[PDB]
Amino acid sequence: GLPWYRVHTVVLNDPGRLLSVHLMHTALVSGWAGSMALYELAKYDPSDPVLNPMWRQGTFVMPVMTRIGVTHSWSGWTVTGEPWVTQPGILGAHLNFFSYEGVILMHILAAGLFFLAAVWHWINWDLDIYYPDGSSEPASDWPKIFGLHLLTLGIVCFGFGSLHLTGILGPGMWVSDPYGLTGHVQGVSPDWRPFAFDPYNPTGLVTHHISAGIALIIGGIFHTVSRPSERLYNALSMGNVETVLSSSVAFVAAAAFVMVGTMWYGSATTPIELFGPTRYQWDSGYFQTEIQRRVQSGQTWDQIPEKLVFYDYIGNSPAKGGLFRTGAMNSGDGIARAWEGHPTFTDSEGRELFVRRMPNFFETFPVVLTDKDGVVRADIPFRRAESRYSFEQKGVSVSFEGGTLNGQTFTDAPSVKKYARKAQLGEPFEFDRETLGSDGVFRTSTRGWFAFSHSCYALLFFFGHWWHGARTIFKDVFE
Amino acid sequence: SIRYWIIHTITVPMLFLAGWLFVSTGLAYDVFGTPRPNEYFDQARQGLPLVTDRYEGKQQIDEFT
Amino acid sequence: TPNPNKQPVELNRASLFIGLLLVLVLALLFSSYFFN
Amino acid sequence: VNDLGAIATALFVFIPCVFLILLYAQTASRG
Amino acid sequence: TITPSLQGFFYSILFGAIVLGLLGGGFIFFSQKDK
Amino acid sequence: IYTVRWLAVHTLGVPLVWFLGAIASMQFIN
Amino acid sequence: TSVLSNFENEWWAGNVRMTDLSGMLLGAHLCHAALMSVVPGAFIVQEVARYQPGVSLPDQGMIFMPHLAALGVGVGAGGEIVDTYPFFVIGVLHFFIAAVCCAAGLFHTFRGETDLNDAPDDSYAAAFRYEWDDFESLSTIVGHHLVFISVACLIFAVNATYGTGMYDINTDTVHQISPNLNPITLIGYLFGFTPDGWSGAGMAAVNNMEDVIGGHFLIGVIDLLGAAFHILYRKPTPLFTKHPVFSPANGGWSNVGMLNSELILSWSVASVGFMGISSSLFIRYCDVAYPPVFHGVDRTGAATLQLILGLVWMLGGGLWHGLRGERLYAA
Amino acid sequence: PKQTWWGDVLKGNNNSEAGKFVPGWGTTPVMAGFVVMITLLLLIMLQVYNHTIVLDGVDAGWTSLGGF
Amino acid sequence: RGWFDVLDDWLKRDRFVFIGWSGILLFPCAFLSIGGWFTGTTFVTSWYTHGLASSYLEGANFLTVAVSTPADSLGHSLLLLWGPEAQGDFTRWCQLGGLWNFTTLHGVFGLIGFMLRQFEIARLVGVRPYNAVAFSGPIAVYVSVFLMYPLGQSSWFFAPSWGVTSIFRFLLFAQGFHNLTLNPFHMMGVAGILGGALLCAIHGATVENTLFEDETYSMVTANRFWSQIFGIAFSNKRWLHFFMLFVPVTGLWASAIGLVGIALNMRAYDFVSQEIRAAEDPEFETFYTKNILLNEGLRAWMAPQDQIHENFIFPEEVLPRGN
Numbered sequence A: 001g002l003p004w005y006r007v008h009t010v011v012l013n014d015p016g017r018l019l020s021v022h023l024m025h026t027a028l029v030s031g032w033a034g035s036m037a038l039y040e041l042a043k044y045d046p047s048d049p050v051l052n053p054m055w056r057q058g059t060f061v062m063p064v065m066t067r068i069g070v071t072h073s074w075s076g077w078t079v080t081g082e083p084w085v086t087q088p089g090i091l092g093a094h095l096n097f098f099s100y101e102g103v104i105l106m107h108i109l110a111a112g113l114f115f116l117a118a119v120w121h122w123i124n125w126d127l128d129i130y131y132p133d134g135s136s137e138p139a140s141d142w143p144k145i146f147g148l149h150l151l152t153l154g155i156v157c158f159g160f161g162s163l164h165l166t167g168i169l170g171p172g173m174w175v176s177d178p179y180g181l182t183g184h185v186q187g188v189s190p191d192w193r194p195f196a197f198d199p200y201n202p203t204g205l206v207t208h209h210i211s212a213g214i215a216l217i218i219g220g221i222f223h224t225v226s227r228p229s230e231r232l233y234n235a236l237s238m239g240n241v242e243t244v245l246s247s248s249v250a251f252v253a254a255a256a257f258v259m260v261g262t263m264w265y266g267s268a269t270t271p272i273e274l275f276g277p278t279r280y281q282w283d284s285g286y287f288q289t290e291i292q293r294r295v296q297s298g299q300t301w302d303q304i305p306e307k308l309v310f311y312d313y314i315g316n317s318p319a320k321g322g323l324f325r326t327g328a329m330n331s332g333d334g335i336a337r338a339w340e341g342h343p344t345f346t347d348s349e350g351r352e353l354f355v356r357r358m359p360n361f362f363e364t365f366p367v368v369l370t371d372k373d374g375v376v377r378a379d380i381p382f383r384r385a386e387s388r389y390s391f392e393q394k395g396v397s398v399s400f401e402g403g404t405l406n407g408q409t410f411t412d413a414p415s416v417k418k419y420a421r422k423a424q425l426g427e428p429f430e431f432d433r434e435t436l437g438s439d440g441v442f443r444t445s446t447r448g449w450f451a452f453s454h455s456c457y458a459l460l461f462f463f464g465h466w467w468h469g470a471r472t473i474f475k476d477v478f479e
Numbered sequence B: 001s002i003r004y005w006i007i008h009t010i011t012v013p014m015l016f017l018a019g020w021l022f023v024s025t026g027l028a029y030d031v032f033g034t035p036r037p038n039e040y041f042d043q044a045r046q047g048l049p050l051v052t053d054r055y056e057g058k059q060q061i062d063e064f065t
Numbered sequence C: 001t002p003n004p005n006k007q008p009v010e011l012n013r014a015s016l017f018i019g020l021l022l023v024l025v026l027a028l029l030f031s032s033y034f035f036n
Numbered sequence D: 001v002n003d004l005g006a007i008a009t010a011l012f013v014f015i016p017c018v019f020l021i022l023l024y025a026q027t028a029s030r031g
Numbered sequence E: 001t002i003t004p005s006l007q008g009f010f011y012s013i014l015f016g017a018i019v020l021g022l023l024g025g026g027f028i029f030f031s032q033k034d035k
Numbered sequence F: 001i002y003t004v005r006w007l008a009v010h011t012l013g014v015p016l017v018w019f020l021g022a023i024a025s026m027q028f029i030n
Numbered sequence G: 001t002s003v004l005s006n007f008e009n010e011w012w013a014g015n016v017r018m019t020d021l022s023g024m025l026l027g028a029h030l031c032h033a034a035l036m037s038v039v040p041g042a043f044i045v046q047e048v049a050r051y052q053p054g055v056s057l058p059d060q061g062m063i064f065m066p067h068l069a070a071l072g073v074g075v076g077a078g079g080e081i082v083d084t085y086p087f088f089v090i091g092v093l094h095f096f097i098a099a100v101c102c103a104a105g106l107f108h109t110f111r112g113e114t115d116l117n118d119a120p121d122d123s124y125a126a127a128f129r130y131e132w133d134d135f136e137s138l139s140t141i142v143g144h145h146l147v148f149i150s151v152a153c154l155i156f157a158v159n160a161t162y163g164t165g166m167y168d169i170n171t172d173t174v175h176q177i178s179p180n181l182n183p184i185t186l187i188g189y190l191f192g193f194t195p196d197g198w199s200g201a202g203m204a205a206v207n208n209m210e211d212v213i214g215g216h217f218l219i220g221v222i223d224l225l226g227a228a229f230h231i232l233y234r235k236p237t238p239l240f241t242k243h244p245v246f247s248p249a250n251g252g253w254s255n256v257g258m259l260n261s262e263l264i265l266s267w268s269v270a271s272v273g274f275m276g277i278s279s280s281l282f283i284r285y286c287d288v289a290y291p292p293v294f295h296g297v298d299r300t301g302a303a304t305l306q307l308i309l310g311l312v313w314m315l316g317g318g319l320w321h322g323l324r325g326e327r328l329y330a331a
Numbered sequence H: 001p002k003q004t005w006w007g008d009v010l011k012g013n014n015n016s017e018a019g020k021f022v023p024g025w026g027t028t029p030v031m032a033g034f035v036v037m038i039t040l041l042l043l044i045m046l047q048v049y050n051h052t053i054v055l056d057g058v059d060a061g062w063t064s065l066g067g068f
Numbered sequence I: 001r002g003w004f005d006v007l008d009d010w011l012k013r014d015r016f017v018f019i020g021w022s023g024i025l026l027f028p029c030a031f032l033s034i035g036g037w038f039t040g041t042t043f044v045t046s047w048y049t050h051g052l053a054s055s056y057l058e059g060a061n062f063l064t065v066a067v068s069t070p071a072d073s074l075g076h077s078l079l080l081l082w083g084p085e086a087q088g089d090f091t092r093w094c095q096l097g098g099l100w101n102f103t104t105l106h107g108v109f110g111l112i113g114f115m116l117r118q119f120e121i122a123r124l125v126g127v128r129p130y131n132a133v134a135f136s137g138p139i140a141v142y143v144s145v146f147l148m149y150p151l152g153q154s155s156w157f158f159a160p161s162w163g164v165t166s167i168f169r170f171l172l173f174a175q176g177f178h179n180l181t182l183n184p185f186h187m188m189g190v191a192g193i194l195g196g197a198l199l200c201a202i203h204g205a206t207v208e209n210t211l212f213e214d215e216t217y218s219m220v221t222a223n224r225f226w227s228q229i230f231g232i233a234f235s236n237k238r239w240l241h242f243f244m245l246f247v248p249v250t251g252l253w254a255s256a257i258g259l260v261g262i263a264l265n266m267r268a269y270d271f272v273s274q275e276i277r278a279a280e281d282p283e284f285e286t287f288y289t290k291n292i293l294l295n296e297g298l299r300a301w302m303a304p305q306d307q308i309h310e311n312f313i314f315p316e317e318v319l320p321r322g323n
Ligand code: CL7
Pocket: A004, A005, A006, A007, A008, A009, A245, A249, A460, A461, A462, A463, A464, A465, A467, A471
C-alpha cells in the first residue's frame, strides 16, 4: 500500500474526488472561522473599549472582521464606544444583520453547504464532464480553468474595491487618526496620484483593488481565450496539475511573507485600534513624543486622552511576550483599570531627573534615574550592594500629575522604588491580577501572534514549493 | 609553456606593486574613509563618531570628519 | 461504479516503532514548555 | 502551572500514537 | 515632482539595464561566435 | 584566445594579487 | 504580409496585417486620432467640473487647464482664471472632432474599400492610391500634411499678434504682442546663441513672447515652402538617393538610400521621440511658454515624463523599426 | 458517466481544448515585458515602503493617516 | 535554430565547470559577495558604526576582521550605493556599512543560484534531485539568520556581522538576550546536527569494517553486528541513506523555526513556575535560576559597549555581581 505520507495521491488522477477534497477543506476552513469567532464572542468584555480593547483580550479574528465593517453585536454593544443605533432602516441596510453573530451564522451555514457538496462530489466521481469527447482517461485543461478562476476572482476583487470599500454599497473600512483615538468604519475614495502608494494611507487600498481588479479581469479574459505556447507548455508541464500545486504554494508563501511584513511594520490594513501598537512605536518614542508635545502645547496633564497614554505602556508592545506564555495579555500583567498619572522625580537638591525607559530587548533593566543633561543622579543598586549614588542616600520624592495619584507626593523609599520601576516600564497604571490569576509576566498582542505564526508558515511553505517543483520537473524520474 | 611567462613576469609584479603603492601612498584611507592612525582621535577628540541619524548620515560623518 | 484509484495504506512494524519514538520524544521535549 | 498543560501534553502523546497504531494494525491484519 | 531619491532610483534602472545588457550581450555574442 | 576560462582565471587572480600586495604593504606599517 | 520575420501572422502583432491595406490603414489612423482627441476634451470637462476659483491652478492638479490658460482662455489681468466656460467650449469641440474622426474610421474600416488599389479607376479615390515603394506617391502626402501643420502654426502666430493675443508673462496679462522678426536672432537659439550668451537648452531660453511668436512665423513660412516643394515636385533628389547609410544590408556604408514601410515608420517614430525630448527641455527650463502662474515652478516630473517617452520612441521604436526595415531591404 | 445538465453546460470549458498549445513561442515574448513591468512596480513599492524612495509629499509613516 | 537554442546549447556544453542557466545568477552574485567580504575585511572599518577596528589597515587579526553591520539609526534601509543615504558617494557608503548589505544580498542570490544549479544538474544527469532538497536547509538557516532576524529587530545592526569573533559575539548576544539554549527548536537543531555527525562517523566505520575481501560491503554482517551490539540496525540500504540525508536537514529546519521565533522576541526565556517558586522563597536554587543570573550579568556587562548607539550608562552599583 501507499506510505502514510502519500495517502492523498489517490485523488491525483481523479478530478472529481480532487474537487471533493478541496470542497471538504473549504468546509473545514469556514467552520473554523465561525467557531473561532463564536468563542471570541463568548469570551469578551465590551464594557471597556479604552483600557481593555480587543487586542488586549486575546482576540484573533475579531480585528480581522472589524477591519472592513463589522463592529456591533446583536446584544447591542459596538466596539467603537457607543451602543449601536439601528441606523439601518431600509433594504441595503442589512447592517443590523451582519453583526458578529450574523457573520458567524453565515460562515457555519457555508461550512455545512460545502460539506454537503463535498460528499456529493465524492460519491459522483465519474461525471461525464471530467472525460473528454472520446477518451476514457479524465483530462482537464488547466490553462483555461485558470482563466475562468482568475476572471471570477477579478470580478470579485473589482466589486470589493469599488462597492464595499468606497462605501457606495458597503460599510467601507476602518480608518483612524495617527494616534489611534477615533476609529470609524467609513468609505474611502480612490485617487491615482502617487501618494496612494503610501502604505499607511487607506486611499491606496481602494485604488489598488479597483485597478488590480480590472487587471485580473483582463488577465482572466486573455487566459480564458489564449492557448499556451509549446515552449512554455512543455517546459512547465502544463498538462500536469503538480505544476499548479508548486506555483500556487510558492505564491501563497510569498503572500504570507508580505502579510507578515505589513503586520509587523504596521500599515493602513493593520490599524493599532484593532491589532494594537507595533514594536517600533515604542522604540521611536512615538506616543511619548506626541504626549510630551501635547502637554507642552499648554494642555494640562489630566487632560491627556487615556488611549494615548495606554499606548505608551511597554506592556502593550508585541516584542515583550514569549513563545509559551499563553492566552490573552490580561492573563499577563493583568487588566488595567486606571492611570496613576504622570510621575516626576526629584532628588535632595531639587533637580528634576528622569528614569530611562527599558528598551524592547531587555527582559529586565537596571533602574537608573539620570539628570536630563546625561549625568546619572540616582539609581537602585543591584539586589544587595553598597552604593554611592543610591535611592535613599540621596533621597528622592515623586509627584504625580493627573490620574489616580494626582497631586500626591510619595517620599517613602519603597513607594518611590515601586513607582520608579513602573516609570521605567512606561506609564504607571492600575493593574488587576486577582480576577484572572495573572502571572505578571507579559504576553504578546494579536499582532505578534500573527507575525510569528505566519512567518513560520511562509518558511515551511517555501520548502513545500521546492519539493513540489522538484516532483513536477523530475516527473519521469519520480516513479 | 614559455610564451605566457614573459607576459606574467612583466605584469604580475606590476600588479603587486600597484596594490603596494595603493596602500603606501595613503590612497586607501581616502578611498575607504579609513582613519589614519592619528585620525582616530585628535589630541583630545576621544569621543566616538557614531551616526545618530539615518537621513543625513554622510553629512553627519562630514561633520565627524 | 467502483473507483479504480483506491489503494490501501501500508505501515510495517519498524515504521510503527520509528513513529512512536518520534512522537514520544517530541512529547517529552515539549511538555516542559507546555506546562510552562 | 497551566491547567491545560497536562491536557495538551496528553493529546500530543495520544493522537499521533493512535493514528500510527491504527495504520499498523490495519496493515498487519492484511497479509 | 521628482525628488533626489526618485532620481537615484531612475539612475539605478539605467545602471541595472546596462549591467544586464552587457552580461546578456556577452553571453549571446559569444554563443553566436563559436556556433 | 579569450576563453571563458581565461576570463574566470583572470577575474579571480587579478584582484587576488592586488589584495595580496596591499596586505603585504600593511604588514610593514608602523 | 510583406514581412517574413518569424511571427507575421500572430494576433498580438495583427496590425502588421494592414501593411498594404490602404483603406483599412487609413481607417485605423482615423480611429486612433479619435482616441487622441477624445482624451483632451473629456479631461478638460472633468477638470472644469472640479475647478475652484480661490485656489490657483498649480495647487489643483490640472494637466490640461494650464495649457489653455496660457493662451488667454478665460483669464484676465494678474493671471487668475475668471470664466471657465471657454475651457468647456474647447472640450466640446474636441468631442466633435473625435466624433468626426471615429465616423471616418468606421467608414474606412468597414464600408470603404479595403485596398485602394481596388478603387474603380479614377473614382475620386484612385487619386489617393499610394504604394510603400514609389516615392512620388508619398511625396504629395508629406506635402499636404505639411500644408496643414504650417497653416496651424501660422494661425497660432496670427492670433497671437493681431487677435486677442496670448498671456505674456512679463507684461502680466493677455496682450497682442508685437512679433520680433530678426531671423538670425531666432535661428541662433537652435545652437544656444541666446542674446544673453550661449545657453545649454536650445530654443528654451527665450525670455519674451516676441521671440516665440517670430519663431512660429518663421516655422510656418518654412513649412509652407516645404509643402510647396514636396507637392509640386514629387521626384527623388540626390539628397535622398545617394546618401551614406550604415547597415548590415551591405556591411558598411552604402549610398543606396533605401525605402521601405518599416523604414518610413522608423523615421517618423524617431522624429516623435526627438520632439518628446525637445519638449522635455522646454518644459524644464522655458517658463515663458509655461508661466509658473499656471504650471507651477517645480516642473521636473513633467520634464522627466517627456524624457522617458522621448527615449522610448527615439531609441526603442526607432531602432526596432529601422533594423526591421533594413533587414527587409534584402528583397 | 452521468450526463447531467450542469455537465452539459460546463464540459466545453472543462476539456474542449484539452492538451492544445500553439507551436513555437507564441505570446511568450509579450509576457516577458509584463513580467519586467511588474518587476519594476513591486520594486518601487518596496523602496517606497523602505523609505529608500521618498515621493514628494508622501510621508511613508503614521503621519499620513491625517485626514480621517 | 534561433538565438535562444544556440545560447542554451552553449550554456550546457561540457567545460571544466558547468555553467547552465543558473550560472548567470550564481557566478556574478557569488563572486560579488565574496569580493565584498574581502574588501570589507581588508580596507573598510567599522569605526563609525560600532566604534571598532575591524580591518587589516586598522591592524586587526584574521580572527578579528569583520564586515560589520550598518549603524542602528538606519533601521532596515537597503543602503543602495545610490540611495538616500549613500547618494552615490562610495566612501560614505562604505563607512555607513553598506558593504554588509552588499555581501548579504548577493549571498542570498548566490544561494538561490546554487539551488537552481543543483536542480539543473540533476535534470541533465537524470536523477532525483535530493541534493537540492538537502540544500534547502542551509538556505533556511541563512534566510532566518541574516534576513528575518535583523528584520524582526530594530535594525540591521543586530544581524551577525560577517566575521569570526563577530559571529561569536552574536552567539553570546543571543544567549544573553534571548536565552536561546533553552529554546526547544534550537535543541532539535543541536540534536539534528550531532546526530548527523554520529551517522556519518558510524556509517563510515561500518562500511570500512565490513568490506569484502576483493555494493561492496557485507550488509548482513553489519546488520547482525549492530543488532547484537546496539539492539537495532538498518536492514534496508535505501532507508539508511535517506535517513542520513533526513536527519541534519530536519535539524536545520527546526533551528530555523527557532530563530524566526526569537526574531520577534517570541522567545522561551523562562519557566513561569520556576520564577514564581523562586519569588516565594530565596533558598530555592536550581541550575535554571543560575542560568538566569548569568543572562542578567551578560546583558548588563555587554550592553554598554555592544549597543554603543544607545548611550547606555550603568554605574558600578547597578551591575549585577556575585557579591
Ligand atoms: C512541509 C513542506 C510542505 C508544504 C507546506 C506542502 N507540502 Mg505537500 N503534498 C500534497 C499536497 C500539498 C498541498 C495542497 C499543499 C499546500 O496547500 C502542500 N502539499 C504543501 C499532496 C499532493 C502529496 C501527498 C499529501 C499527503 O500524503 O498528505 C498525507 C499527510 C498526512 C496523512 C498527515 C501529515 C501530518 C501533518 C503534520 C498534519 C497536521 C495537521 C495540519 C498541519 C493542520 C494545519 C493546517 C495548515 C495550516 C497546514 C504531498 C506530498 C508532500 C510530501 C512532502 C514531503 C510535502 N508534501 C511537503 C509540503 C510528500 O511526500 C507528498 C508527495 O507528493 O509524495 C508523492
